[PDB]
Amino acid sequence: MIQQETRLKVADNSGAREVLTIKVLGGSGRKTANIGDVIVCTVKNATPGGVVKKGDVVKAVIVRTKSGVRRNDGSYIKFDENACVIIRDDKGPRGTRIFGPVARELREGNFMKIVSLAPEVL
Amino acid sequence: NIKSAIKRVKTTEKAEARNISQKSAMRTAVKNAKTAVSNNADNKNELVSLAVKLVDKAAQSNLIHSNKADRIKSQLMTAN
Amino acid sequence: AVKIRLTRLGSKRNPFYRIVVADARSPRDGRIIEQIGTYNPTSANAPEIKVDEALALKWLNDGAKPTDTVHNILSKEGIMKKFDEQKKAK
Amino acid sequence: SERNDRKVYVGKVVSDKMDKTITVLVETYKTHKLYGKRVKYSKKYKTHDENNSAKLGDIVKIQETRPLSATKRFRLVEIVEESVII
RNA sequence: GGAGAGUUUGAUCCUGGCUCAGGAUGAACGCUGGCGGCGUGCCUAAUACAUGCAAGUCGAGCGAACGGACGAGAAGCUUGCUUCUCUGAUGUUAGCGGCGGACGGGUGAGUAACACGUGGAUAACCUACCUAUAAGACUGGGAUAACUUCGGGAAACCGUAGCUAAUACCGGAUAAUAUUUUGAACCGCAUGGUUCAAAAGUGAAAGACGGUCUUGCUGUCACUUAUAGAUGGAUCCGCGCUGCAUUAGCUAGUUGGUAAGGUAACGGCUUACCAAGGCAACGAUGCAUAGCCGACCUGAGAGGGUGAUCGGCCACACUGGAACUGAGACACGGUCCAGACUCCUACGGGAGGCAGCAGUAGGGAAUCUUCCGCAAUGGGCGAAAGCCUGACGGAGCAACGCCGCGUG
RNA sequence: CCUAAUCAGAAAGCCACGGCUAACUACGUGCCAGCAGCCGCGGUAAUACGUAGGUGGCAAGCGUUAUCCGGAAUUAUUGGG
RNA sequence: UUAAGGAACUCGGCAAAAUGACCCCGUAACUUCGGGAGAAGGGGUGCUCUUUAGGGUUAACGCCCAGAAGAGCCGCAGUGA
Ligand SMILES: [Mg+2]
Ligand SMILES: [Mg+2]
């Protein structure tokens, strides 16, 4: 489960391609994370252009986890990868697109701008 | 935008289906023909003369047009 | 697809058409094959014209749909009388 | 069609070490626009020999053909003057 | 048809650089301002674009609906209303099908090479329409849109079950230089070419409108086959076509051969094999810059610079790729795919492409009206009338320039 | 476009003036403000700055800037050392 | 052996795991020009059938040796340990 020093892909129009998970906001020393859990990340590489750069540090919201979530109907889900999306506590992204489909349980946390964009709510 | 060529679309699709049926019917006839070259009965003349009719039953319309037809006959009316 | 036709050459207000043979694919005011004759609808009414009328028949004998505005003046010169006098001859 | 007396070019040879083939060096001399003099620059026209008939060092002319291959067009027509050690 | 003047020094002649006078701009800026004729107007961000139009046409090929002039029978008597029956002129347009959308208009990101110019070749090619000629124009069938009816679809649009035609589509018959094969003559630039003789091989609309009318006859147009003509296109070739050598080795499908395949055609165009050649100081290669030419500016002239308008050639159409229809496109207002971008959505999914005319933002020192019209010329369809034509005619804005008159 | 009528009433400016270059005098200014294409002006009497007057040029056009050729025989084959 | 993560443990990636054979492509800096260099990185490998190159050995038969080309079959995995 996503935790400290975990490298992820991304999904948006950033100029960035992967990140690092410093801290996993919540409680009093959480170790873990899953879908929906905001995190504090940084940047370990970059494609050229784009707003963000190396050495930067920003938050993110996890999605496309590889050990997926259990729905209360008793159904599960699993992706292949791990990923995240950049964010500014509008709970609305910086980016303009979202590749790489999304997990819907974000909706409980009242995220809808990225759900406007994601193929598909799943 | 689109104005009128939508006609030529539908027409293009009809003539697509027709033309490929003609061509591929020929091509299978040619396959039979060249494969009949190995054989010894005849079993050749029926097939090869038939296909050399079909080349012309189907050449008058499509893009071939004659020169290449005449090359196909040129090689194929000789191998038997 | 070959049509003797007109290629206006004057400036703003005083046009001076030219008779010329051409294929219809071309632009009007562009490329041609050979000039013959000419035209001038003013500075004298009736107009001032010339004509080859020697090889102008050549292009008709081997193909043309000569237009009507031309056909009129070729009648005014009357070379078409020789044209049909050979074509509808036989 | 019978109109062209083909471009006949004298020359001499530079190789025979390819099949059915030789490599003529036809040469000229041409003037120079700023000045009014003459000067000579060569070329190397490849060729179709029938059966590697003619030799190296030979004195021969050629003629326009049609594209026969990729970067050889010309024929041989007539070797003029053949000899060995000169 | 051609002009020199200054300037190093206490003063001189020389060599030597710099500056000035002239002409020219697709030109901007400052000042100023009357008018007409002519000609011009995104040279920058090939940056993104709202709104309008920019390519349809044929009912004299076809089925099918609207329509209602005229004629008329009974009438509820309101004696012109009308129910039907309806006679059916003129006309229309949804659709099928034929030809055009590839021409015409616009721009110059790319491209250093047969791309362009010029001169040649094709015994290595293609060519709808339009002309001329010759021959034909026989005999059959089965479907299907519109139209009825059902369903899924938010919408885009899709499918279901019947039904109908044609210059649609599919067979057969017949048809010569057209393909194989055989032989005689003739010919040459080499492979090969021209003609003659003989065995096998393919088509068409029984079509439409009209006259005579015997509905026969024959006409106009239309279709098919063939041979030419011309037109348009293609490939190859010699030559000329930019700068650096602080760019000197490059290339392996490269170079050559064999065979096959492929294409309108030739060809390493492409596969399988044999081979190691090929190109280069006469500047290969690699590198940055760029559309070219006729022409324009200047100069007495040789020459130097540029490639605005006008015209010829080429490439491109959001970027990139592929292919169908078709005579011709690998298609500027066509598709299919992937991508970036913008947008609609019931979130399942769909839509689009101004470097067409105008116009808007953007950049920039700087480049205009969301104009009238199809009278003319040229286009496209048609039998013609006719219709469409932001090509084009032509009005408007700018002292942008040339020319001209005057402010007595 | 033509024909008749009406009023000199609506309709003129820009640059430069030491030489190169056609085109001079007064004021203010005093190495300050300023000009400049070159050479150079300017420290209390500036023909070179700013103002006036006048003049020359030019014309519904004029000056400056950027670019190109000339002059440049300063890539010189014509035409050098 | 161990899903998710992958040196955060830690004095220190100690140890453990990963790589590992054959052939082919390819292989920088620097250099005492020998090397670096197995650099790196990357690919293929199984059985059957067919066709073919071959070389050594012999009178020849056949006995050995190790390649290429196609075409097929299977399994997640073909130097299957
Ligand atoms: Mg990892
Ligand atoms: Mg690490």
From Swiss-Prot, chain A:
TM segment ranges: none
InterPro entries cross-referenced by the UniProt entry: Ribosomal_uL14 (IPR000218), Ribosomal_uL14_bac-type (IPR005745), Ribosomal_uL14_CS (IPR019972), Ribosomal_uL14_sf (IPR036853)
Keyword Transferase: no
Pfam families: Ribosomal_L14
Superkingdom field: Bacteria
Subunit structure: Part of the 50S ribosomal subunit. Forms a cluster with proteins L3 and L19. In the 70S ribosome, L14 and L19 interact and together make contacts with the 16S rRNA in bridges B5 and B8.
NCBIfam families listed in its UniProt record: rplN_bact (TIGR01067)
Protein name: Large ribosomal subunit protein uL14
Swiss-Prot record, chain B:
Keyword terms of this UniProt record: Ribonucleoprotein, Ribosomal protein, RNA-binding, rRNA-binding
UniProt-recorded name of the protein: Small ribosomal subunit protein bS20
Name of the encoding gene: rpsT
Organism expressing this protein natively: Staphylococcus aureus (strain NCTC 8325 / PS 47)
Recorded family membership: Belongs to the bacterial ribosomal protein bS20 family.
Pfam family, one: Ribosomal_S20p
The protein's role, per its UniProt record: Binds directly to 16S ribosomal RNA.
GO cellular component: cytosol; small ribosomal subunit
InterPro entries, per database record: Ribosomal_bS20, Ribosomal_bS20_sf
GO BP of this protein: translation
Swiss-Prot record, chain C:
InterPro entries: Ribosomal_bS16 (IPR000307), Ribosomal_bS16_dom_sf (IPR023803)
Key words, A-Z: Ribonucleoprotein, Ribosomal protein
Positions of transmembrane segments: none
GO terms classed as biological process: translation
MF annotations from Gene Ontology: structural constituent of ribosome
Gene3D superfamilies: 3.30.1320.10
PANTHER family: 30S RIBOSOMAL PROTEIN S16, SMALL RIBOSOMAL SUBUNIT PROTEIN BS16M
Protein family according to the UniProt entry: Belongs to the bacterial ribosomal protein bS16 family.
Protein name: Small ribosomal subunit protein bS16
Organism, scientific name: Staphylococcus aureus (strain NCTC 8325 / PS 47)
Gene name tied to this protein: rpsP
From Swiss-Prot, chain D:
Pfam families the UniProt entry points to: Ribosomal_S17
RNA-binding keyword on record: yes
InterPro entries: NA-bd_OB-fold (IPR012340), Ribosomal_uS17 (IPR000266), Ribosomal_uS17_bact/chlr (IPR019984), Ribosomal_uS17_CS (IPR019979)
Self-association and partners: Part of the 30S ribosomal subunit.
Cellular component, GO annotation: cytosolic small ribosomal subunit
Protein name: Small ribosomal subunit protein uS17
Primary gene name: rpsQ
PROSITE patterns in the cross-refs: RIBOSOMAL_S17
Keywords for the protein's UniProt record, in alphabetical order: Ribonucleoprotein, Ribosomal protein, RNA-binding, rRNA-binding
Family in the record: Belongs to the universal ribosomal protein uS17 family.
Single GO BP term: translation
Biological function: One of the primary rRNA binding proteins, it binds specifically to the 5'-end of 16S ribosomal RNA.
